[PDB]
Design a protein around this ligand. Structure first.
Ligand code: PLP
Ligand code: PLP
Ligand code: PLP
Ligand code: PLP
Ligand code: MG
Ligand code: MG
Lengths: 391, 391, 393, 393
C-alpha cells in the first residue's frame, strides 16, 4: 500500500543509525581509512558508497533509495530545483543534431531552456498538442532523440493519453528517450515508468517538500537510461544539499494524507466553480469534461490540488486588482504544492505566448488556484467574495 | 582592510532584521500583496526584490552582496557546488562553433565537462601550458570565445602570469570572456577582476565554507558579463539552498584568521619538505623556486594551505599503503579548505593523463597536502613518521 | 468538521515574521543589535513583549510560534522549553515555594512524577496524588497549602480521561487561587481546549504531534492572563528557551496537524475496535472507544482523538514471550515517544505500571501494550498485529 | 604556543559519530528505535552512558560534543543545556536542598545572582557574597550549611580575576565536601583548566566563544567524577538538553576556537594598551593588561586571553552623551552577548554596576564601557574608538 511505502521508503538502519529518520550527514570530504577503502569507494562512487559529497552522503542515498522504490526506477538523480532537473535531464541525452519533441503545454522555463539554451547548441525542438495521442508518430523525425511529456500540462491542465503516445513513439523510434515532468502527480499518483516512460522528473519543491520552504529536483530513470543520466548530470555538477534531501524524505511521510486532502478539497472547489455563473470553464483533471479527464480517471490513482478556471469575461486591469488584491485566505505567489492556498491570473494572450505554434481556445481571464489544507468552506467563501468584487 | 570587510560584507539591516547574521529565509513561493507589488517584483527579479525562490531569498541576496563587495564584481551567481559553477559559467557563454582555451592544469572535472559535455554540443577546447604568459596570443583562434585560467593549477600548483595572459588575450580578442577558477585564493587572496578577468569562479565548498560540511559554487562577474551569466545560469536552474548560503556568509567572517594560519603553517611545512632528503621537489606557490612563484609574490596578498610535493622515488603499491594507511593526523579524502589536514597521492602517469597534450616533468610519486589548523609541529611529526615508513 | 484547519494554516504568520515567504524566517541569534540607545531602552522595557532584545527571550522565529500557540490554545502567553519534560518541571517550579503542596493525578507521565518526588521534595514542596476519575471528590484532598493541581487527560499509558469540569469546579470551590495545570500533549493542545475549561496553564510536549515527525524536541506552556507573568519570568530565571530552528519546525508542524490528527483518529479507532473483539485482548484503553475509562468525558469535552492508545493482553508475557512478540514486527517499531508518522509499540508489565501509580494498584493482570498508530495503511498495521498475536498464542 | 590546536580539531570525532564525514552526523530524534527487547534492556541500563535510548538523553551528535568537552576540560561528564543561564541555574539547583547555603562571588553574571535571590531563596536556600579578591579569607565566610561555592573569573563586566588556588585551598580546609563551581565562559573553558585547579564543575555559556558566531545558544557543565552522577541525573529531571543541530554547531565552533582566541587576545590587548594611555580613560579592566585587578593571577593561571574587557571613561556620560557616543559607531555594534566575530560595545553606568555588586560599592565614578573585540582589523577599530572619544570630549 502506498501509505505504508511512503512511511518506510529509504529508511534502512545504515542511514537512520537508530533514529526514525535518516541522519543528516553534511560533507564534501569523505574519509578513506586505507588505500583499499578508497579504491572500493571509487568503484562504487555512484552505487551508494561514501566517496565525495558531490555524489552524496548517507542522507542523499536514503532519499535516492526512497524515490527509486516509490517511482519504480533504477536510479534517482538529484538537482538544486525542478527547473535544474528538467534542463539537465534533457541535456544529458542530447548532442548537436538531435531533435526534442515537447508538449506545447510544458512548463514555461522548460520551453525557455529548449529555445534559449538547446537551440544555440545545435539541438532543435518541435512541439505537439497535448491531446495528440497516437498521431504523435507523424511528428517523429529521423533525428528525434527525446520526447518530453507533461501531464497534466502546466496552467491549463490538459492530460495526455500516455499509453497512446508511448505506443506510437515505440513503433517509430523504439530507442527514443521518453521523459515526463510528473510534478503534479508528485511522482506517485501516476506511475510513469510503469507506462513505458524512461525518466520521471519532478520539482520536489512542490508536493514532496509540501511546505513551500525547500527547493529540489529529482529524476528517476529506468535501467536503460540511468547510467547516462547519472554521469552526465554529475558532469554538470548537479546535486542537492544534505539538509534539503532530508526535508524531502521527511515530506514523503505525510504525502499520502496531504494529497488526499488536496484532492478532496480541490475537486469540491472545481465542482462548485463548474456550476458558477461567472465561470466559463474549469480545467481540473478530476472534473468530468475537462481535457483528458478520461485518461486521468484511467491512468492516475488520485489528484493533487492545482487546477485552473476561465472567467466569463476578460478582466480589465482595474478589475484584476480589485479581484486579486483583496483575498483573505488565498495568497498571490508562484509555486504550489504547499499547505497554503494560492491564486494567480493570466490573460489569454499570456498563455498563447507560451503555447508554441498554437493558439488558445478561450477569451476570459484564466485563474490558477492551488488548493491547500485550509477548510474548504472558508476557501469557497473567499472565492465567492472575489466573484462579488468583479460581478 | 580585508578583515573588517570580511566581518561586515553583506550584513545590512534589510537582511539581518536585528541579528548579527542574515536571517535564513526558506522559500519557493514568495508572496505578493498586490498586483502592483507583483509587477515591481517581476521587474526586479534579478535585482534583489523577492520574486521566486529560484532567484533567491533575503539570505541569498545577502551572500551575493557580500561576494560582489569582496571580489569587486557587478553580480554573483550561486550554484550547487564548485563543479556546477564552472560547468554552467562556461556553458553560459558558448554556443555551437565556439572555442574554449583552457589551462592544462585545470581541475579534472572542469576538463571533463569540456571534453565530455561541450564537445558533443559543438564547442571545441584547446589547451595551454600554465606558464605560457604572453605567448597565449598565438593560440587564440577566430572562434575563441572563452579563455579559462586556474591559478594556482590543480594538484601541481603552477601559478599563471595573469597580467601577461590578459594583455595578450585583449590584444587579439578584446571581447573574449576571460574566466578564472579562483578557489585556492578563496577569491580574496587574488583580486581577479582587478586584473581584467571577467568572471571569478569559486568552489565555496572549500575555504569559504571552511569546515568540510557544505557544498556551493559562486561566480562573480563584471558589469559587461553579468546579465548573460545571471540569465543563462538561471535557465539551467542553478541556485543554492538558503541554509548553505547562510553558512557561506558565516564562513566569510573567519576567512581572514583561517587563511593566515593555513599560510603560516603550510609555508613552514613546505620549507621543511624542501630541505628533506626524501623530497625531490615542493610545489607551493609561496615557496621560492616553485613554478610561477614570482607571480604569486607579485600578484597575491597571501597563500592558502593546499600544496603538493614529489617524493624522491616512485612508491610501489605496498609502499603507498604503508605510507598512506598509517597517518595519525592527516586524513585521506578529496576536497580541502577545512580545518582538518588531508593527504592524497598520485603517480606521475595519473597526472599526465589529466594534462592534455602534455607530459609531466617528474617521476616520483606526488603527494598533495592540505594543511589545516592543527599544531604544525604535530603535523611535521606525522609527516616524519610517514617518511620513516618508506625510507 | 475541519473547523481548525484554516487557523492551523495561518496561525502566527504575520508579515513582520514571514518577510515575504510563506513561513516565518529563521532568525538565529544570541546578540540582537540596537541601532540606538533609544531603541535599546524600548527593547528593554518590552523585552518580554515581543521586541527584539536578546536571544534568550527569543527572535522573530520564536515570537511567531508563541503567537500561533496563544491563538490556537486561547492563552495570554506561551513559554518555550527544550522539551516537554522541561516544560512540566519548570512550569510547576515557577509556581511553588517552600511549604507548598502539589496535587497531581496518579496517571501523570512518570518523569513528571519523578520531578515532584526527587526534586520538589528536597526543596520543601510536598506532593499528593489522586485517582484520575476522582471528579468532584478532589475537593477533599485540597489542603490549605495546595498551590498546584496537576491534571493529565488522557492519562499516560493507561489513557484514563478526567472529568475536567467536575475537577475544576471543585478546586474553584475550595481553593479558587490554586494554579490548575494540565499536560495536554495527547490532544496536541487543540483537541481539548483546556483554557476554556478554567484550567490556568496547558503544557505540551510539542515533541509529539506538533513536530509530528519524531525529529525535534520542544516543550510549550500556554497560560491565561492571571498566570502568564509569573510563568514567563520564573521560567526565564531558569534559562528556559528553545532554539530558533526547532521553533520554526514546530510552527511548520502546525500546518499539517489537522490532516494528520484526523488520520491518526480514524486509523487508531479502527485498530481499537478490532482489538476489542479479539480473543487475545482483555481490555482496550482508547478514549474514543465506547466503554473506555472516561470515554463519556472524551465524547463530551474533546473535538477529536489522536492515535496513541493501549490494550491489555489476555496474559502477562514472560521476558521470552515479550521478545518473540516485539522483536518480530514488520511495521511497528519499538521506541519511546509518539506523535509521528510511524507506528510504534511498547510493552509495560502490570507490575511496572503499579510502581508508577502512587498510592494505587492496577486493575489488570496482563501485559499492557501501548500503540502509536501512524500514517501507514491500517490494513497493513492490522496484519502486523495479527502476526504478533500468532507468535504468542 | 598553539598547544591545543590539534586537540580542538580532533576532539569528539570518532568514527561511530562521524560515519565517514569529517564532522559528526546530525541525528535529529526524540524516538530512538530498539531492534530487540535485548537492545532496549542494554540501552536502558546505559541510558546515561552513551547508548542510544531517548532523544532527551541525546543522540550521536550530543555524544560527540560531550566527548569533546570532557576531553578539552578534563572532566568525567558534560551536561548540556538550552543556554548558559540554564546551565548556571540548573547546575546550582542540582546540588542544593532546603536549608543549604550558596557562597557566590559578587561579580557573578547578573542572571546567576537573580536565580539565587529570586528562585533559590523561596525554596529555602540562602545565598551569601564575597569580593572576587578575597582569596584565602573566603574561609571565614563558609557556614556549616554552605554546599556550593560559586566562582566566576574574570568577573562579569568588571573583569576581576580570582586567586583560584587560594580560594580552593581555603574551601578544602574548612568544607572539603563543598561543591566548587566556576562560570568559565570568558576562558571558553580552555584558557583556564578549572578542573585541574580542584574546582568540581566548570560551566560555560557555549553561546559565546564556542559557537563563535553570535547565532546559537547553549550551555555546558563539565563535572569531575565525584559530582557527575548528581549533575547528570538532577539536570535530566529538569528536562535539560540542547537540540542536536546546536550541539553540532558547538562541536564545529571548537575547530576554529584556537585561531579565533589568539586573534581576540592580540587585538584586544592592543586596544587595551592604547586605552590605558588615553587622556579620556580613567581605568582599563583587561586581565592580560598589567595593573588590572587580578592580572598576576591571570598571568600565572591562564594560558591566554579572550577579547572581552572593559574600561572606565574619565566622566559619567549623561543619557544625551551616551547616545552621541554609542549611536554613531561605524564598526562596533550595540548588543548583549559576545564571543563572536563582530566587535560589540555596551555601557553600564557606575550606579548600575553597584546595584549588581551585592554588599559592595564600586570604586569608580565614570561610565564603564564593555568592549568585545572581534576579528576586524584592529587599526579600524581604534579609529572607531577614537571617533567616539571625539564625540564626548
Ligand atoms: C514548479 C515547476 C517546475 C520547476 O521547479 P522549481 O523547483 O521551481 O525549479 C518544474 N515543473 C513544473 C511542472 C513546475 O510546476
Ligand atoms: C573542489 C574543486 C572544485 C569543485 O568544487 P565542488 O564544490 O567539489 O564541486 C572546483 N575547482 C577547484 C579548483 C577545486 O579544487
Ligand atoms: C513525551 C511526554 C512528555 C515529555 O516530553 P519530552 O519532549 O520527551 O521531554 C510530557 N508529557 C507527556 C504526556 C509525554 O508523553
Ligand atoms: C552570556 C553569559 C551567560 C549566559 O549565557 P546565555 O547562553 O546567554 O544564557 C553566562 N555566564 C556568563 C559569564 C555570560 O557572559
Ligand atoms: Mg502560441
Ligand atoms: Mg597528457
Amino acid at each position: 500500500h502506498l501509505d505504508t511505502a511512503l512511511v518506510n521508503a529509504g529508511r534502512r538502519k545504515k542511514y537512520t543509525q537508530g533514529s526514525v529518520n535518516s541522519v543528516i550527514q553534511r560533507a564534501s570530504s569523505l574519509v578513506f581509512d586505507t588505500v583499499e577503502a578508497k579504491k572500493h569507494a571509487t568503484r562504487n562512487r555512484a552505487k551508494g558508497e561514501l566517496f565525495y559529497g558531490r555524489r552524496g552522503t548517507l542522507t542523499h542515498f536514503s532519499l535516492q533509495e526512497a524515490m527509486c522504490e516509490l517511482e519504480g526506477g533504477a536510479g534517482c538523480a538529484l538537482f538544486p530545483c525542478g527547473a535544474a532537473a528538467v534542463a539537465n535531464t534533457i541535456l544529458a541525452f542530447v548532442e548537436q543534431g538531435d531533435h526534442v519533441l515537447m508538449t506545447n503545454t510544458a512548463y514555461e522555463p522548460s520551453q525557455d531552456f529548449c529555445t534559449k539554451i538547446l537551440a544555440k547548441l545545435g539541438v532543435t525542438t518541435g512541439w505537439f498538442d497535448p491531446l495528440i495521442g497516437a498521431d504523435i508518430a507523424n511528428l517523429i523525425q529521423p533525428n528525434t532523440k527525446v520526447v518530453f511529456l507533461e501531464s497534466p500540462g502546466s496552467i491549463t491542465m490538459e492530460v495526455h493519453d500516455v499509453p497512446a503516445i508511448v505506443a506510437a513513439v515505440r513503433r517509430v523510434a523504439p530507442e527514443a528517450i521518453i521523459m515526463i515532468d510528473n510534478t503534479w502527480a508528485a511522482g506517485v499518483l501516476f506511475k510513469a515508468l510503469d507506462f513505458g516512460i524512461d525518466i520521471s522528473i519532478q520539482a520536489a519543491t512542490k508536493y514532496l517538500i509540501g511546505h513551500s520552504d525547500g527547493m529540489i529536483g529529482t529524476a528517476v530513470a529506468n535501467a536503460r537510461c540511468w547510467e547516462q543520466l547519472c554521469e552526465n548530470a554529475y558532469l554538470m555538477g548537479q546535486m542537492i544539499d544534505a539538509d534539503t534531501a532530508y526535508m524531502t524524505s521527511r515530506g514523503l511521510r505525510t504525502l499520502g494524507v496531504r494529497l488526499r486532502q488536496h484532492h478532496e478539497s480541490s475537486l469540491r472547489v472545481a465542482e462548485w466553480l463548474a456550476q458558477h455563473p461567472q465561470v466559463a470553464r474549469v480545467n481540473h483533471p478530476a472534473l468530468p469534461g475537462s481535457k483528458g479527464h478520461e485518461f486521468w480517471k484511467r491512468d492516475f490513482s488520485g489528484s493533487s490540488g492545482l487546477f485552473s478556471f476561465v472567467l466569463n469575461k476578460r478582466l480589465t486591469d482595474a478589475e484584476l486588482a480589485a479581484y486579486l488584491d483583496n483575498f483573505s485566505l488565498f495568497s498571490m505567489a508562484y509555486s504550489w504544492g504547499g499547505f497554503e492556498s494560492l491564486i494567480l491570473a493570466n490573460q489569454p494572450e499570456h498563455i498563447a505566448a507560451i503555447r508554441p505554434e498554437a493558439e488558445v481556445d478561450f477569451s476570459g481571464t484564466l485563474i490558477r488556484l492551488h488548493i491547500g489544507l485550509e477548510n474548504v468552506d472558508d476557501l469557497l467563501a473567499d472565492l465567492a467574495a472575489g466573484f462579488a468584487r468583479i460581478v
